[PDB]
Amino acid sequence: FGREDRFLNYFASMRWFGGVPLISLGKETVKQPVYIVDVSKGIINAIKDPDAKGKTFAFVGPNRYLLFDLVQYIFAVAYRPFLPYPLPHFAYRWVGRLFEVSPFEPWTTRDKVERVHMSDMTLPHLPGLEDLGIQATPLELKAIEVLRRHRTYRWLTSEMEDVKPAKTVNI
Amino acid sequence: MWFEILPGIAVMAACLFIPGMATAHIHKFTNGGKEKRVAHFSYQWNLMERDRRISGVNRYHVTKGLENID
Amino acid sequence: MFMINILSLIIPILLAVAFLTLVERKVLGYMQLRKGPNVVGPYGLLQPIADALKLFTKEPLRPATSSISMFIIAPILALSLALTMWVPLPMPYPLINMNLGVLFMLAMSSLAVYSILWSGWASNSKYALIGALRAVAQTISYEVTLAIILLSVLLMNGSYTLSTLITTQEHIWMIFTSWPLAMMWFISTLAETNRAPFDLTEGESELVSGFNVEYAAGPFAMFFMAEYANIIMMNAFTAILFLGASHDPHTPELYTINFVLKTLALTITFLWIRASYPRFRYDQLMHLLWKSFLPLTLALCMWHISLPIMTASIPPQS
Amino acid sequence: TYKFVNMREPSMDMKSVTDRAAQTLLWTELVRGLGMTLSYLFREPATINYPFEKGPLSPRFRGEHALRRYPSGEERCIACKLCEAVCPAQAITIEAEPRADGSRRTTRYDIDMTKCIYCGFCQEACPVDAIVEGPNFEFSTETHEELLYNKEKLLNNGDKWEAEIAANIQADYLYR
Amino acid sequence: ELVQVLRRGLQQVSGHGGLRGYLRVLFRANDVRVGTLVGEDKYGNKYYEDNKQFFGRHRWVIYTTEMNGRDTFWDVDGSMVPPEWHRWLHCMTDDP
Amino acid sequence: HPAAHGVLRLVMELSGEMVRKCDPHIGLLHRGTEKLIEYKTYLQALPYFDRLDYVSMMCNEQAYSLAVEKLLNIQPPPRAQWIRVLFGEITRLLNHIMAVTTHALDIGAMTPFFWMFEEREKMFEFYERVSGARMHAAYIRPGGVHQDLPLGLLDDIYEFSKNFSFRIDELEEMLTNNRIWRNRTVDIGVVTAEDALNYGFSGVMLRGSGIQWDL
Amino acid sequence: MNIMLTLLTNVTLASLLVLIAFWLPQLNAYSEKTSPYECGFDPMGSARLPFSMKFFLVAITFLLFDLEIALLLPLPWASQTNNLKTMLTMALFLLILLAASLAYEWTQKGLEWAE
Amino acid sequence: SRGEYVVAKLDDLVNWARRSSLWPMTFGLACCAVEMMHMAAPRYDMDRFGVVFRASPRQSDVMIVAGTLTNKMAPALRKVYDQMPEPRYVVSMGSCANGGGYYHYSYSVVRGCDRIVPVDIYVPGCPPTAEALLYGILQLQRKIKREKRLRIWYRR
Ligand SMILES: CCCCCCCCCCCCCCCCC[C@@H](O)O[C@H](CO[C@H](O)CCCCCCCCCCCCCCC)COP(=O)(O)OCC[N+](C)(C)C
Ligand SMILES: CCCCCCCCCCCCCCCCC[C@@H](O)O[C@H](CO[C@H](O)CCCCCCCCCCCCCCC)COP(=O)(O)OCC[N+](C)(C)C
Ligand code: SF4
């Protein structure tokens, strides 16, 4: 997640469609997003780390969120009304397939649907950002710099610590 | 350049000719070629309505000549 | 078939605006010892097409602090009113024959100011707001004088029908009867179209881009198109009102050609005036309209009421 | 010795008052301005047809730098570094050493053209007419790095523009 | 006097090598003047002269359509002039 | 901003369109020139004065050269002094053209700018002929001038001067008696002689209030 | 009927122009690009703050002078009445009072903007 | 093929429209703005190429950085560059904007405007003559002519 990302931006972008379609209302999906700057710093550190030659790293954020809670926090930071509704897998796959016909960059695809409504694997045996010296930056300290662009003029000057950090599924 | 400004003014003049001439030609085409009738007042509208009824083809512009009075 | 007439009125006006851009640029260039565009096409003919294509392929901008509904409505209202102001003009047959044509022009002209007002307010910027308030002041300056001038001139016409103005001037132009009113009307039309020396709302030296500072690409282009179309329409109205061409009922082409030539003469006069003079202060414009134009307008309105009665020259068509 | 610019008052003659009233009511001065601008409309414009026509220049014109040679093809520069010491912008960097034949010649000669102010002090300082400012001025590039000249580029500039640089020097060296 | 400037325009059309050459120069150089040919270049450029023009228009070049490796029919630039004609064309000398 | 001369950040407080306070923020073109001069020799520091007031180059060179000549206790030769005064007057013409035309452009008279910048271009040609640079010259040095005048320059200067008065006349025809121009300029920015003297004014800023002073 | 069609055509053409302008080009909007425009820097206050109006007195008078137009526009038809002497007396009366109201506001310094 | 021919023709039309209508921002800093003004003067007549100054950045196609960029002005230059709707181009004019020039070692000067904004054309000089800037502008026009946006889109 970052300024030019398709994650925080993607969820914010679906506000126009009146409601927020979520498979099973986003209560059976867990996400662990990671900051873009943390990934870049980890790549740079892996470049100049002799011990990281033939290793495999998992770059994950410090917190795991349920998809419903994550989208609710996204809409709360953007100060938009949140109107989620459940959608079956077949119908929402169908609308993804319908969007796929765009000759330009598609708004969403079936594969994007699958990835969005897929829980994040937990691989504790793999090295992470803490093994490259990177302390993962939580979403709460960096969501405003992405989602302030999605606010209206009324809420444009709202500060960072005003939007009640989201509920976390931490172990 | 000064006569090189003339092509642009000529193109503007040609563009500005089209509205009036097209309007006049369309008025003549849809009124039997006789300068579409003007009705500022109710008397002229009554005249057009009477003409529309008399012709029998439901058109005001089809004038009925003295030959219609046997 | 009537839709064909609407299209044949609309499209040529847009093309004429596009090439008035070129004509203004070239006239100002040659009046400034340079040439103006000659490189794009033969004699700069393709320059308007290049500008139009460049603008409509450029990304439109929506300000973060702007209220989007009015931001989008304002250029649409401007362009639509600019196109609507053309339908009652007799060249020599109007597209829409109105019994009160001059009143219709006055009303649509008054409504056309809200384009500038709403664009300046919805931009949510200080320069745009300053331009909008300058538009308010300009309208307050010119409106009453313009209406009284129109009334005084049309008192010799006998009605508000624009087609009757041709019959009024079968033998003489009304500029020989009301040239002082013609002068004040010309200045009022300069002030009404936001043209130099009264281009206060844009205020280029003073306020950067003024009211349309925020606007970019196609939306900006629409405002520009509307401004030029209003220029041409007001000069056509001035030509009909004060320089009456001779209309042959069996050959309207002569009237159309003579009308177009007079309209072009008046538009080039606007370009000339822009090239010759500096800019007023908008408080000085109000004092000019309320302390110089208004007293003469009232005196000449009384004079033009009294003249037909004491002369036994009252026009027909009560 | 001084003169006044705006201390004249107008006559109160009846016809003078009438003339001023006619000017106020009939806008005669504005018509005079319109006449001036109309007279300019009918004059020939001063525009030239670039790039097919060029503005006039002079032999003294300072343009793109170049390193020159002697008629035999030997370089003129002897690495005295007077141009480097005089450069107001410190745009010249020079390194030297004895050549294989023992000649005193540079091994590095760079000019940063994004530092250079095109003052020509370097060619006034040079005792052998090695470095000059040529007549070329149409050498805009698409990257910053292309304006960091080294010795190869400057020697190539000299070889390219010698036929004109020599003629410009021939027409002006008697003023120097 | 008007008929004479019309004759001059017609002569300009004729002296460019017919209508095709007239259109070619009008769409390449954006100018239809005719002057005495001072000389031709090693690469195809032609240099004309007209001393009755004011200072700045009295000399010009009609660029070649084919420089070292590229087609310069539309894409021309001032860097295509060799140094000797560069000196003549910028009025640093009176000698071609 | 078109009327901000490029690098002026004017912070104004306004009630309506009325001006309550002007707070000019400068330094957006502060290049630390005085410090650099301390790191150069006297000859190397001369182009800085070209670049100081880039509308009057020869005059800045002349002032710097006069200061350095005063410190050196030397004297420029007579022909050098005559050349200096000639090109100083040409530079005055250039600067006054720029000032008047840009002032008219800011007020709204867009036309005389183009008429007068042709004369400015011809004077740039004079600069380039005598030195090789259109505006940054560096012709005036602290011992005299760099090179002698080319053999045809005085004739061309005479040709330009015998025609420039008509251009000034056309300028005055456009502006002097115009009632719009007078309304925009008359009784605007009125400064008293005593305030002008105290506030450190000089030049036309002093002579407009009636102070009879000229260096 | 025809005026409705004309208005619909004009509005639809303008709307299609806006639609083309907004959906044809490549949009790339980021927070810095859409920020409010001051000349170089960020604005101090808001454009929604009160903006003082120095010609407030002339604006109110414009309302009263505007309605004097509604009283004078039927004058071309009033000239066709039989009794012209009472019409001309009333029309001149309606303009003398309009002139006297302008004179009153002028002399009492009502036409000058607030300083 | 047929689609590639269509996209090539559309590239030609779009690039022609874009290069023929280049509207620079009314933006200038120092010495070089005078030569830019002289390019706007009747002798060179930048208008005749389709190039006209416009004050608002939202109505600008090109930014010409003509003069010294100082540390105090760099945020303002970046701000007015970011508010230009794309496509946008930057021309660097003179030594000061190219690499710092004659104030390169100053404490208050940005050593080249390309540290702040990406630059398309570097015009060298102090100041570049009006023909030098005209050559740079026409070079930018040729560069715009050479770009292939829909050919690359069609081959994605
Ligand atoms: C239908 C609405 C959408 C399209 C609207 C289009 C409007 C009409 C199109 C305008 C046509 C004009 C373009 C052609 C003019 C180019 C002139 C010529 O010189 O181009 C040469 C090269 O050819 C052009 O690049 C061709 C460009 C046009 C390509 C074909 C146009 C295809 C039109 C397709 C429109 C379809 C759109 C419909 C979509 C709904 C290079 O010129 P150049 O040298 O630089 O210019 C002068 C500089 N000099 C002095 C050095 C010479
Ligand atoms: C008697 C004591 C009065 C004291 C109170 C004074 C206060 C009021 C001011 C004067 C009274 C106004 C009465 C006028 C009533 C109008 C009707 C009458 O006067 O006849 C009219 C005569 O017309 C005259 O013009 C009357 C008006 C003349 C007075 C000018 C106005 C000045 C009044 C002062 C107050 C205005 C305030 C501003 C001061 C300037 C019309 O006659 P005519 O047209 O045949 O018939 C029409 C019917 N038709 C159609 C069948 C033919
Ligand atoms: S011209 Fe001046 S700044 Fe440039 S290299 Fe020579 S001495 Fe240095």
Ligand code: SF4
């Ligand atoms: S170019 Fe000339 S001054 Fe510079 S090092 Fe070589 S010989 Fe010496």
Ligand code: SF4
């Ligand atoms: S490059 Fe030279 S002329 Fe241009 S701004 Fe810098 S110092 Fe001044």
